[PDB]
Amino acid sequence: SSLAADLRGAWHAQAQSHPLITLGLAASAAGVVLLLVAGIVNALTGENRVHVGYAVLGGAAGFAATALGALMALGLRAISARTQDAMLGFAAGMMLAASAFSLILPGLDAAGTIVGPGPAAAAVVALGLGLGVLLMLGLDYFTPHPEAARVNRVWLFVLTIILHNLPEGMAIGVSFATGDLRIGLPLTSAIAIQDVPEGLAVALALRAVGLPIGRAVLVAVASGLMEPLGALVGVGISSGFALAYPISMGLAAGAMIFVVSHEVIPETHRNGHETTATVGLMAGFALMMFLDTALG
Amino acid sequence: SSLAADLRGAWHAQAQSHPLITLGLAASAAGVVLLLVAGIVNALTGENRVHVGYAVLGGAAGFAATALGALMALGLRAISARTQDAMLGFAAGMMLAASAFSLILPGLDAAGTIVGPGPAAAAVVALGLGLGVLLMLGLDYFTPPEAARVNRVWLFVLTIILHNLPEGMAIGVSFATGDLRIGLPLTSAIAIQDVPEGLAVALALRAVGLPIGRAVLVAVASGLMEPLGALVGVGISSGFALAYPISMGLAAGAMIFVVSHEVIPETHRNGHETTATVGLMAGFALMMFLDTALG
Ligand SMILES: CCCCCCCC/C=C\CCCCCCCCOC(=O)[C@H](O)CO
Ligand SMILES: CCCCCCCC/C=C\CCCCCCCCOC(=O)[C@H](O)CO
Ligand SMILES: CCCCCCCC/C=C\CCCCCCCCOC(=O)[C@H](O)CO
Ligand SMILES: CCCCCCCC/C=C\CCCCCCCCOC(=O)[C@H](O)CO
Ligand SMILES: CCCCCCCC/C=C\CCCCCCCCOC(=O)[C@H](O)CO
Ligand SMILES: CCCCCCCC/C=C\CCCCCCCCOC(=O)[C@H](O)CO
Ligand SMILES: CCCCCCCC/C=C\CCCCCCCCOC(=O)[C@H](O)CO
Ligand SMILES: CCCCCCCC/C=C\CCCCCCCCOC(=O)[C@H](O)CO
């Protein structure tokens, strides 16, 4: 009846019930660890020369944006679901444009120069892109959605609340892996716009579980530490070999498209203000497209 | 009766009872926050071009060493206090030599080229060096019956997670120049330290009342402060030319305070005083030996 046994049993249960999601998670997990090892072994042997500095400031900004919203949960009055859906809807739009125009596109240009700009450029991004979708489909499924029992769920809840921002951080690290501000700033800022609404929501979600407002906020602030930590994971997976960057550019794109469509867009519609949320999605997408078009 | 109010009152209480420890902490905190902003503003305006990469892999090693020791708390049999005193005494010896020979020395050479190798070199490390002692004295002093017993398990786990941030900033400061002869000795010294305290942190949480697995899970997560702290360490070393030698001193003072006032008392508490002391000698001597070999 230890939560370790509870996790192993539930993980056994879902692996039996969803074998392809489970197999697709095993493969993606394997790739991430392999590109990470490769990127560490490359570093240990000299010769790496990645751009960690910009990724570290990028991850830190995200820490602050999460905290910012986390602290909005102590304010007086309230923020209606109506305003949150627009805030979350706008961010989801900038996040869609960013993984299209700041990660999938440059990742083709990346893989273009190594292996050829044809179907060979397209199939290297795809290896990442499908791998990122499968990665976050498995984490969605192998993550949770009566005194001793009720407590362990607060544990299983707080831990996926803490970790869930690691991918958003790894996308940040991958955009900045070449130190290119035109690749990085659009993505990093788009995740920072998203972090404010999710910071508030993460915090209020914890208060709903039963933590007093202050620990609930302190846990919400600690959630943003995964984006500095993830950015470190992102730079290392981009860097074992020449093909690791475009694969990773693809994998971050896949991870971020899955999170928006299958996780955040349902949050906007669940509150019921469907029209205002999707018009934001258009506004977020269009303006992000405009800014990448301007800076080129 | 909220835990926020309980912390605010106790911080008011300790600031009244220890005014110089309190002002000495206000001052040190101030410098670190200032050297960080300065170091970030430097990057945002271009011109920084430091390589965090070396500090990042160093911080990652520390994560693993803490995790390593944390997971030893699931083992069969047990590890005697006698063996733990030797492990911790040896590490404290390597940490003293390292902040002497890998942080204070190079920090003098640093301030040497900037302002001169006389008393001008010595007073720039010292500004930092006293600032590191003052920083870790204040953190020692300002960190710690149903509703009451729980808020201390909260305040306990919270300082348990945070306590490695300074050990992490020392790592970032050794590597702030990407010089492996400064960096490797220091970070390896803390990684040797990280294994024994990882075991202790895990067992200490289990003694508080967390089941063995969450106690181990919290212990593993404590090691994340050394990657994160190392980022803080790179930013304070880098606002201006004098920020590096100050920070070399500031980590040295912070690390000397932790060894002498925190790690050495732990080794004696279990009672095997002699073995801890010759270990500390062995750790110091070999570390000196390796710095002399590496030059
Ligand atoms: C738009 C396309 C939609 C298609 C979605 C399905 C994607 C497939 C998901 C995961 C496949 C992972 C690729 C490696 C498979 C090798 C399985 C080889 O077999 C194995 O390794 C098993 O252990 C066999 O038991
Ligand atoms: C930023 C997030 C990155 C985190 C990466 C780690 C998270 C999840 C870790 C592991 C997933 C393991 C799933 C086990 C499936 C085994 C059945 C099927 O096993 C298999 O079929 C094997 O392929 C054997 O051939
Ligand atoms: C509990 C709180 C823990 C805090 C967690 C977040 C840590 C991040 C905080 C500050 C990061 C500043 C380090 C970057 C300094 C060098 C800029 C890098 O710029 C560069 O040097 C580039 O190479 C330029 O080319
Ligand atoms: C308690 C720990 C500290 C937490 C505080 C977090 C500080 C927030 C840090 C940076 C905000 C802006 C970062 C932008 C990404 C890097 C752009 C770099 O861009 C540039 O280089 C210039 O635009 C031109 O060079
Ligand atoms: C390695 C290269 C891989 C090649 C491409 C494979 C990528 C897989 C692409 C898309 C899979 C995402 C759709 C997820 C379907 C199940 C979610 C649905 O979950 C649900 O919510 C239920 O249906 C109930 O509503
Ligand atoms: C909860 C788990 C989340 C993960 C927590 C973070 C701990 C692991 C952090 C980083 C692992 C990879 C280090 C960076 C690899 C890039 C080498 C650095 O690049 C370089 O080597 C430079 O170019 C010079 O050496
Ligand atoms: C890596 C760990 C670094 C963490 C640093 C942040 C933690 C420090 C937190 C709070 C500082 C304590 C303030 C004490 C007030 C004394 C009033 C006296 O105030 C004053 O009169 C003037 O400010 C003197 O300068
Ligand atoms: C051993 C731990 C290792 C490192 C831990 C670093 C994380 C930081 C841990 C605790 C934070 C201490 C800050 C307390 C501020 C007290 C000022 C309060 O003063 C006041 O509020 C009065 O107004 C003063 O007059």
Residue numbers in the entry:
A (entry chain B): 5 to 149, 159 to 309
B (entry chain A): 5 to 148, 159 to 309
Question: What wording appears in the published article?
Answer:
While we were trying to crystallize BbZIP in the apo state to reveal alternative conformations, we found that the EDTA-treated protein was prone to form aggregates. During the extensive crystallization trials in lipidic cubic phase, we identified a couple of low pH conditions (~pH 4.0) where diffracting crystals were reproducibly obtained and found to be in the apo state (see below). An unexpected finding is that BbZIP has nine authentic TMs where the extra TM (referred to as α0 hereafter) is located upstream of the eight TMs (α1-α8) conserved in the entire ZIP family. α0 appears to weakly associate with α3 and α6 via smooth surfaces consisting of glycine residues. Inspection of the electron density at the transport site indicated that there was no bound metal, confirming that the protein was crystallized in the apo state. When compared with the metal-bound structure, the binuclear metal center (BMC, the transport sites) underwent large structural changes. Indeed, when Domain II in the apo state structure was aligned with the corresponding region in the cadmium bound structure, a significant displacement of Domain I was revealed. This structural rearrangement is largely attributed to a 9-degree rigid body rotation of Domain I relative to Domain II with the hinge point (of the rotation) located at the extracellular end of α6. In the apo state, the lack of metal ion at the M1 site eliminated a key H177-mediated interaction between α4 and the other TMs in Domain I, leading to the formation of a short 310-helix (spanning residues 176-179) at the bending point of α4. As a result, the cytoplasmic side of α4 underwent a large displacement away from α3 and α7 in Domain II, which likely facilitates the relative movement between the two structurally independent domains.
